[PDB]
Write a protein that binds this DNA or RNA. Structure first.
Ligand SMILES: [Mg+2]
Ligand SMILES: [Mg+2]
Ligand SMILES: [Mg+2]
Ligand SMILES: [Mg+2]
Ligand SMILES: [Mg+2]
Ligand SMILES: [Mg+2]
Ligand SMILES: [Mg+2]
Ligand SMILES: [Mg+2]
Ligand SMILES: [Mg+2]
Ligand SMILES: [Mg+2]
Ligand SMILES: [Mg+2]
Ligand SMILES: [Mg+2]
Ligand SMILES: [Mg+2]
Ligand SMILES: [Mg+2]
Ligand SMILES: [Mg+2]
Ligand SMILES: [Mg+2]
Ligand SMILES: [Mg+2]
Ligand SMILES: [Mg+2]
Ligand SMILES: [Mg+2]
Ligand SMILES: [Mg+2]
Ligand SMILES: [Mg+2]
Ligand SMILES: [Mg+2]
Ligand SMILES: [Mg+2]
Ligand SMILES: [Mg+2]
Ligand SMILES: [Mg+2]
Ligand SMILES: [Mg+2]
Ligand SMILES: [Mg+2]
Ligand SMILES: [Mg+2]
Ligand SMILES: [Mg+2]
Ligand SMILES: [Mg+2]
Ligand SMILES: [Mg+2]
Ligand SMILES: [Mg+2]
Ligand SMILES: [Mg+2]
Ligand SMILES: [Mg+2]
Ligand SMILES: [Mg+2]
Ligand SMILES: [Mg+2]
Ligand SMILES: [Mg+2]
Ligand SMILES: [Mg+2]
Ligand SMILES: [Mg+2]
Ligand SMILES: [Mg+2]
Ligand SMILES: [Mg+2]
Ligand SMILES: [Mg+2]
Ligand SMILES: [Mg+2]
Ligand SMILES: [Mg+2]
Ligand SMILES: [Mg+2]
Ligand SMILES: [Mg+2]
Ligand SMILES: [Mg+2]
Ligand SMILES: [Mg+2]
Ligand SMILES: [Mg+2]
Ligand SMILES: [Mg+2]
Ligand SMILES: [Mg+2]
Ligand SMILES: [Mg+2]
Ligand SMILES: [Mg+2]
Ligand SMILES: [Mg+2]
Ligand SMILES: [Mg+2]
Ligand SMILES: [Mg+2]
Ligand SMILES: [Mg+2]
Ligand SMILES: [Mg+2]
Ligand SMILES: [Mg+2]
Ligand SMILES: [Mg+2]
Ligand SMILES: [Mg+2]
Ligand SMILES: [Mg+2]
Ligand SMILES: [Mg+2]
Ligand SMILES: [Mg+2]
Ligand SMILES: [Mg+2]
Ligand SMILES: [Mg+2]
Ligand SMILES: [Mg+2]
Ligand SMILES: [Mg+2]
Ligand SMILES: [Mg+2]
Ligand SMILES: [Mg+2]
Ligand SMILES: [Mg+2]
Ligand SMILES: [Mg+2]
Ligand SMILES: [Mg+2]
Ligand SMILES: [Mg+2]
Ligand SMILES: [Mg+2]
Ligand SMILES: [Mg+2]
Ligand SMILES: [Mg+2]
Ligand SMILES: [Mg+2]
Ligand SMILES: [Mg+2]
Ligand SMILES: [Mg+2]
Ligand SMILES: [Mg+2]
Ligand SMILES: [Mg+2]
Ligand SMILES: [Mg+2]
Ligand SMILES: [Mg+2]
Ligand SMILES: [Mg+2]
Ligand SMILES: [Mg+2]
Ligand SMILES: [Mg+2]
Ligand SMILES: [Mg+2]
Ligand SMILES: [Mg+2]
Ligand SMILES: [Mg+2]
Ligand SMILES: [Mg+2]
Ligand SMILES: [Mg+2]
Ligand SMILES: [Mg+2]
Ligand SMILES: [Mg+2]
Ligand SMILES: [Mg+2]
Ligand SMILES: [Mg+2]
Ligand SMILES: [Mg+2]
Ligand SMILES: [Zn+2]
Lengths: 211, 58, 159, 105
RNA sequence: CCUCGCAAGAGGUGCACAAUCGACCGAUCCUGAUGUCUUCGGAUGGAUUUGAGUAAGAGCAUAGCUGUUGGGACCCGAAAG
RNA sequence: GUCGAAUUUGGGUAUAGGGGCGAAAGACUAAUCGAACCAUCUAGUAGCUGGUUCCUGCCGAAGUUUCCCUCAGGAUAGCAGAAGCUCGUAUCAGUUUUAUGAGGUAAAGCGAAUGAUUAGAGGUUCCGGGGUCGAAAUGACCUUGACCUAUUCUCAAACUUUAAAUAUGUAAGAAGUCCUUGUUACUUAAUUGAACGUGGACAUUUGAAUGAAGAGCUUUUAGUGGGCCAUUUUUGGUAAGCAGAACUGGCGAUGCGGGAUGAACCGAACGUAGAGUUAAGGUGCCGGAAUACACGCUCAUCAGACACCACAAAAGGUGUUAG
RNA sequence: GUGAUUUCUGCCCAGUGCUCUGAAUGUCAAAGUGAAGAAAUUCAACCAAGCGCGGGUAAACGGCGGGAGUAACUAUGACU
RNA sequence: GAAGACAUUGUCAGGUGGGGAGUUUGGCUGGGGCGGCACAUCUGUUAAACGAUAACGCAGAUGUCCUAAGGGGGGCUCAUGGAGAACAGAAAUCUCCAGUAGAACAAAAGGGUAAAAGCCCCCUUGAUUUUGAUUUUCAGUGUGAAUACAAACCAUGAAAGUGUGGCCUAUCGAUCCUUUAGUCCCUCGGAAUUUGAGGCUAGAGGUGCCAGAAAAGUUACCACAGGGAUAACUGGCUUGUGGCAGUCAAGCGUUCAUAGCGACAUUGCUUUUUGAUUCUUCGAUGUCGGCUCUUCCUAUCAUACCGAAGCAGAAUUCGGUAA
RNA sequence: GGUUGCGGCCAUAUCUACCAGAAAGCACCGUUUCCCGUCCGAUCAACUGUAGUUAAGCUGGUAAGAGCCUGACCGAGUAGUGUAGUGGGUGACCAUACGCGAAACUCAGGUGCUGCAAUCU
């Protein structure tokens, strides 16, 4: 009873969120956006490869989840379930309606049907971090999730360290200096702004200008 | 038997044939809406200076 | 069905200017208005009495009358193919003096100056305003400044 | 609603022409009286044949009425009228709204 | 149109019309003098009221086109009563 | 079918139209019956259908507003014609510039409020629950939740600090500006003010641009009150040559060149003609006009061939081309 | 109204009809009566049939239930 | 002989009276009907940053409620959270701290509001009198609602002030008739007095189809004027649904992704499905099925020749050229 | 320059933490006969200026402070947008032509100005 994904492919309607005014909507077929070793430290996984959309279109949750499987499945069984962090970067917040079915076209406002993510051109769908030696495994990983989606998307080697905001040399310059300290799966950065007091408490290994 | 509900189509073409005529200025507009207390006294003020300029021709 | 009430559609229009809520500052009531002043109309949601209708929001008019708490304004509102004269009764909170004439009042007493200070000198005035003219010729030097040659850059990605 | 049985308000009675105290009561009806020209003219149209000769109203919408207070100047005798907004329950008795009380039993 | 000026201009008077403030008559409301068959009389001066009014008349009549209403009503047409 | 009877049948006679007659079918009552036939009221009414008769000249629409037992119709405003009338460099403008306002859409934002959403990290419990120690503890230790703190991925027609473009109000002088100092019953402590004035000073570089086959004004009346299409914005619908809005431009009411063909596309709007030049579109032949010039690409056992437009997708190729 | 014969035509009068030696103090027209009033008129009491109250009636019009449980497997349910 | 002032008859009055007469038996609407109310209104959004703006668009609301929940003055500060106090526990009352409003202000929503517009108290009736102007809706009609003055009479506060109902945006009603208030006024036309009646000004009794008729069915016995403005059949656009065909390859197939199959996804084709639409036809294009006969399509069931096989043979399955 | 009374603008004035403040002022502060108000002279009212104090308020300074304000060819001529074509693409979309042009970000600078009257080493 799922209408072919051809029917909702394009972005024809204003965003229709689940809201106080919507309320009846089903649940997203894709509920988990972080797979593999997502506790991993920022230094562990320098190599970042994105799945990037070349279209302005809509991705169903059922196609999202189905691709998330295919990609995370290929990666674990070849490089191992700890070798990568797959981050689904796109959340299906927008509700597709359907006019189910006696009168025909009178009063035709539909009821929630599925969910989709509204996707830009150049907008990232999947993001993966590993170490450079794992590249060709990652890439074939996303390349098969490609087949799960409508519309052209292209894989892209990031100029960035993992999921950080910095290019690999600029992360190195900052990290071999004091400015970077670990967190969570992410990092924090020493700011030259604010109270000097606990700016030094945190980041003790700065304030040398040496190793 | 449904039919077109409404449109403003063609309506500014019609408006522009003969019109959008500018507001029509006048020296000496009306006192319409003006405060009675003001206007009652003003009635006398003018009658005063009118009586003045009469005794200015004598 | 449809809903057309007096304040309909005015959600953000009568809203208060972020972190500007509360009392109206006291200058608003010290300002003094006379018949003939041009005023701008901006309704203040905090004062519900004497409020202009939303159509006159952002509209300039001429005060025709002055009362205890209020000034009457006349506005030319155009209905159909003509204009009609609407007169509005507004609390002073909704009305500010218009700057629309100040460049004219500046320019009159300025054009009066360079008129006297010229004629008493023997004429040569030119006090009408002229538009932006095309600029004249000029000679740009190369001294300390040699052209820096630029070319189109190639395609990169960086994401 | 609930309104008082007394009202201090403007009396126009020309010997007072000032604020006095009014006894407040609810206006009612008044009797038919044939010989009102309307009933007299209607009674004639109705004799003979032809059936009902005038419309007879059916499609009733309002579930309420507008209450009309009869104000009475206790001094100068002249009575005035005032008409309240539409209301479903009207007592001009008493038992005012009361303070902070606690619901009973 | 009149006066001045060679002319440009300036002043004088300004019908029709238009804008504006007033005055007059009736209505409404207020005021209520002199007097009186002590209840008649209603001067006088007023008022965000009001009239299809006054303020040196513009009509009446015949005729024409166009338009209006009633009429068989531009022509032919019900089922019925 | 029935054929000796509730049989067939002639003639005479009775019953008449909201009436008759009916072994009952709304049957029959003179080819007429869910109310016969004849004349008259009667040219009944018809918001409905059809038609409405000579030529040329000029101007030239509407399918929209409001009200209607209104939705196939009227009234009302609008658009249209006509008649003009008072004036005239005058005043006028579907335009720009300058000055000064108004706005919360687009984008943007979420380590800003509200609301949603992925992930961890670090804290806080006499206190949500579980478990070991236990007589217990306002006990200690794991623990999982909730919260708090600094971070992190992602969103909003009915969220938002900020915030456009286009569109929009007002102003750009003689109805202006300055001086002197009158009137009043309003107003002031007050000849204070407010309003309206008398008298005086400065002309067209008199106060931005461009245009102006002038501007202003009055009366009366037609048709219309089914609209439809295209680019852009845009709602409902999987969609529709589908339904509904916004601004403009069209078609309708309109031929002409082009798109073979075609209401709406492109070009361009029509008095009768001559010469020239073009538009959109074309120039192998049909067919007016280079089987022109130039560099590449393409070989298809269903090649391809020009907008609107008369469809094709994912996904593939050790065909060939260039990266 | 039902439709030869044969056989049998059960329960229901609350409803709508029909109908009655019924009840009585409910309601109820014109006239007539009484009261007030200058009179027009107003108010009152009385009051026919009828309605209401009551009784009869289905070969009058017509109607003729729903939920649980329950018997030495299950099932079923005479029974509740 | 019978009957007898009773019957009868006449005039009014009540009952009864589809036996008969006359009439009526809303609108919008993706045909009409059922339904809903988009029929009079309010908030937010759709609405494209002035204004306007449509659908049986989206989320809601209105026919009320209040002598205070109206008016004025004074005082006070709210939601929550933290830390404390006998019974007392998650929740009782008491205290301090923090607290931009996270509360409350009848109700829908959106504005608005902090020595308030919220909470407690004190005093009250301006929710009053007169008659104009103005804003929204608009025709610049009416109604509703609202604004700012004028003229009273009042409230409250030391006062400035404020107050013409409810913080703002909804909460409602012609002509005729009846009824009441008002001045004590005009008229009853031969003249008075008194009842009665009629006028004038202002309210109430209501029209919700909300610019405002007094209104049940049935027709298959049916009628007329029309409509392709409008349904049922062909055909047209659409292709959700139906049907057929791919791509990725997790799985199935003893082992083995693809011999034969194939999930999660996803791209398509088709017009013997059914829907959606309402363009053509309502001054008529003869419905279902069968019989008969022709011709065409191919997504091939058989027959011809082939390639695969989890093809030993036999049988079968998948595929190709094939109508 | 300080302070006070009344202010205008209404965070460059607010917030958090500390330090400093002479003279005057303000304040805290003392009393409850009186007018007045409270459960409570805490608030409020009156009386004292006597008997005390800079502790608080108040003023100012400090902080790679939070916030807020201002600026910049920081981002970015980016996003978006008015106009154009028989422009590209099956489409979704996109490029170009003549114009207009943000927000975040990044960086630097800043932390009340000021009117009237009185008063003060
Ligand atoms: Mg619905
Ligand atoms: Mg793909
Ligand atoms: Mg219709
Ligand atoms: Mg249509
Ligand atoms: Mg129409
Ligand atoms: Mg609405
Ligand atoms: Mg409207
Ligand atoms: Mg109010
Ligand atoms: Mg009477
Ligand atoms: Mg009477
Ligand atoms: Mg009286
Ligand atoms: Mg009232
Ligand atoms: Mg006939
Ligand atoms: Mg008839
Ligand atoms: Mg007959
Ligand atoms: Mg007859
Ligand atoms: Mg007869
Ligand atoms: Mg015949
Ligand atoms: Mg016959
Ligand atoms: Mg005829
Ligand atoms: Mg005829
Ligand atoms: Mg009609
Ligand atoms: Mg022409
Ligand atoms: Mg009507
Ligand atoms: Mg027609
Ligand atoms: Mg908006
Ligand atoms: Mg928004
Ligand atoms: Mg947006
Ligand atoms: Mg932003
Ligand atoms: Mg947020
Ligand atoms: Mg939250
Ligand atoms: Mg625990
Ligand atoms: Mg402009
Ligand atoms: Mg010119
Ligand atoms: Mg000319
Ligand atoms: Mg007309
Ligand atoms: Mg018309
Ligand atoms: Mg119409
Ligand atoms: Mg066009
Ligand atoms: Mg036509
Ligand atoms: Mg045309
Ligand atoms: Mg044309
Ligand atoms: Mg073609
Ligand atoms: Mg053509
Ligand atoms: Mg073009
Ligand atoms: Mg040929
Ligand atoms: Mg040739
Ligand atoms: Mg091409
Ligand atoms: Mg193309
Ligand atoms: Mg290739
Ligand atoms: Mg029989
Ligand atoms: Mg018998
Ligand atoms: Mg029986
Ligand atoms: Mg029994
Ligand atoms: Mg019975
Ligand atoms: Mg009976
Ligand atoms: Mg009687
Ligand atoms: Mg029964
Ligand atoms: Mg007798
Ligand atoms: Mg009958
Ligand atoms: Mg009948
Ligand atoms: Mg209908
Ligand atoms: Mg219905
Ligand atoms: Mg209403
Ligand atoms: Mg809008
Ligand atoms: Mg708007
Ligand atoms: Mg609906
Ligand atoms: Mg608490
Ligand atoms: Mg309307
Ligand atoms: Mg209303
Ligand atoms: Mg209140
Ligand atoms: Mg009376
Ligand atoms: Mg007489
Ligand atoms: Mg009398
Ligand atoms: Mg009398
Ligand atoms: Mg009535
Ligand atoms: Mg109606
Ligand atoms: Mg209506
Ligand atoms: Mg009938
Ligand atoms: Mg029959
Ligand atoms: Mg049709
Ligand atoms: Mg399909
Ligand atoms: Mg399908
Ligand atoms: Mg195998
Ligand atoms: Mg296996
Ligand atoms: Mg396997
Ligand atoms: Mg037909
Ligand atoms: Mg035909
Ligand atoms: Mg035929
Ligand atoms: Mg045929
Ligand atoms: Mg094998
Ligand atoms: Mg000291
Ligand atoms: Mg200190
Ligand atoms: Mg202080
Ligand atoms: Mg700072
Ligand atoms: Mg294009
Ligand atoms: Mg672009
Ligand atoms: Zn009195």
């Amino acid at each position: 009873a799922r209408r072919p994904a051809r029917c909702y492919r394009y972005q024809k309607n204003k965003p229709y969120p689940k809201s106080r005014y919507n309320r009846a909507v089903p649940d997203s077929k894709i509920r988990i956006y972080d797979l593999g070793k997502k506790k991993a430290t920022v230094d562990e996984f320098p190599l970042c490869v994105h799945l990037v959309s070349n279209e302005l279109e809509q991705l169903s949750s059922e196609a999202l989840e189905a691709a998330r499987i295919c990609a995370n499945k290929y990666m674990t069984t070849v490089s191992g379930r700890d070798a990568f962090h797959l981050r689904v970067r796109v959340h299906p917040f927008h509700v597709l309606r359907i006019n189910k079915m006696q009168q025909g076209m009178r009063g035709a406002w539909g009821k929630p049907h599925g969910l989709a993510a509204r996707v830009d051109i150049g907008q990232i769908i999947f993001s993966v971090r590993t170490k450079d030696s794992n590249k060709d495994v990652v890439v074939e990983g996303l390349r098969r999730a490609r087949y799960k989606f409508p519309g052209q998307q292209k894989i892209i080697l990031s100029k960035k360290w993992g999921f950080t905001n910095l290019d690999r040399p600029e992360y190195l310059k900052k990290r071999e200096a004091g400015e970077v300290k670990d967190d969570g799966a992410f990092v924090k950065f020493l700011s030259k702004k604010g109270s000097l007091e606990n700016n030094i408490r945190e980041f003790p290994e700065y304030f040398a200008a040496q190793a | 038997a449904k039919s077109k509900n409404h449109t403003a189509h063609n309506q500014t073409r019609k408006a522009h044939r003969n019109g959008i005529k500018k507001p029509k200025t006048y020296k000496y507009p009306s006192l319409k809406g003006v405060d009675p207390k003001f206007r009652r006294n003003h009635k006398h003020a003018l009658h005063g200076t009118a009586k003045a300029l009469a005794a200015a021709k004598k | 069905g449809k809903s057309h009430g007096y304040r309909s559609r005015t959600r953000y229009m009568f809203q208060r200017d972020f972190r500007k809520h509360g009392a109206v500052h006291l200058s608003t009531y010290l300002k003094v208005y006379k018949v003939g002043d041009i005023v701008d109309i901006k309704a203040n949601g905090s004062i519900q009495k004497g409020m202009p209708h939303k159509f006159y929001q952002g509209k300039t008019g001429v005060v025709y009358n002055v009362t205890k708490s209020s000034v009457g304004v006349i506005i030319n509102k155009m209905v159909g193919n003509r204009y009609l004269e609407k007169r509005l009764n507004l609390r002073v909170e909704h009305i500010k003096h218009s700057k629309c004439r100040q460049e004219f009042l500046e320019r009159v007493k300025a054009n009066a100056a360079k008129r006297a200070e010229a004629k008493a000198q023997g004429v040569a005035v030119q006090l009408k305003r002229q538009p932006a003219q095309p600029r004249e010729s000029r000679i740009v030097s190369t001294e300390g400044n040699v052209p820096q040659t630029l070319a189109p850059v190639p395609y990169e990605t960086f994401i | 609603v609930n309104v008082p049985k007394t009202r201090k308000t403007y009396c126009k009675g020309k010997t007072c022409r000032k604020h006095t105290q009014h006894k407040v009561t609810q206006y009612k009806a008044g009797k038919a009286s044939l010989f009102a020209q309307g009933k007299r003219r209607y009674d004639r149209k109705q004799s003979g044949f032809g059936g009902q000769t005038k419309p007879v109203f059916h499609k009733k919408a309002k579930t309420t009425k507008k209450v009309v207070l009869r104000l009475e100047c206790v001094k100068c005798k002249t009575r005035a009228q005032l008409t309240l907004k539409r209301c479903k329950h009207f007592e001009l008795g008493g038992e005012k709204k009361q303070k902070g009380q606690a619901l009973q039993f």
